[PDB]
Design a binder for this molecule. Sequence first.
Ligand SMILES: C=CC(=O)N[C@H]1CCN(c2ccc(C(N)=O)c(Oc3ccc(Oc4ccccc4)cc3)n2)C1
Length: 256
Amino acid sequence: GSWEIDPKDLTFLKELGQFGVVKYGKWRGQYDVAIKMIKEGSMSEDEFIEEAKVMMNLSHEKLVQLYGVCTKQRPIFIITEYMANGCLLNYLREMRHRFQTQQLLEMCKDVCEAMEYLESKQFLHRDLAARNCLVNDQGVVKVSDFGLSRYVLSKFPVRWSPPEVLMYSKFSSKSDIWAFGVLMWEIYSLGKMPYERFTNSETAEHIAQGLRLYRPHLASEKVYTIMYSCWHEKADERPTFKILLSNILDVMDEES
Ligand SMILES: C=CC(=O)N[C@H]1CCN(c2ccc(C(N)=O)c(Oc3ccc(Oc4ccccc4)cc3)n2)C1
């Protein structure tokens, strides 16, 4: 299989972190990889295997590169590039990095470039959040687990969902745009949980009454305008990822 990796070619070396376990390893004793082993029973494997073919064709510098899958096993393995600094959410929470706001904005831009590419290929992420982004050895943020929620068999991403998703299950590019605004908020808040005082239940009720996430102190007024634009009540009034990207570039230039 063009999408098919022989598990014999994989050496397991260290552990890295519901879906199952990830391990760091080498392919042909030579190439760094991460190996997510899918917990048996947790996933719709045949559907996933068909989708993997499409995912295999997705290629972008800011998207985590899939190398293949091990099918014909139990559990299946998903093989990607190794991202040394692990998940974005944890990275943000390590206060030792002492990020400059220019570094936070670059994280936003990395993700927005990935999401712009997905949007140009009509591919919906469907669970975009800092927990599902990864960070490489150079501090580059990349989008991970794209589309994966479709195959997983009170744990729903309420805090990253627009009102039409919460009320009617209307997913669209514009529900990814909402989630992206919430990811900018996570970044500027250095990894706080969105609506940090509320339960999921309260968050839904508050979103329906028009509540929005407050401006994190590290966000400039112009950066807040951007994430705020992602949360219009009317989906059609939210920007595209292409517009978000140009806005993020403008701010980078103005706040250089
Ligand atoms: C913040 C929460 C947390 O602890 N998350 C932990 C759980 C994932 N963990 C990691 C850590 C490092 C890596 C790494 N590449 O080096 C990693 O690789 C993955 C991630 C997803 C994946 O499956 C895919 C499905 C669809 C599209 C693309 C990939 C396959 C490999 N996963 C951290």
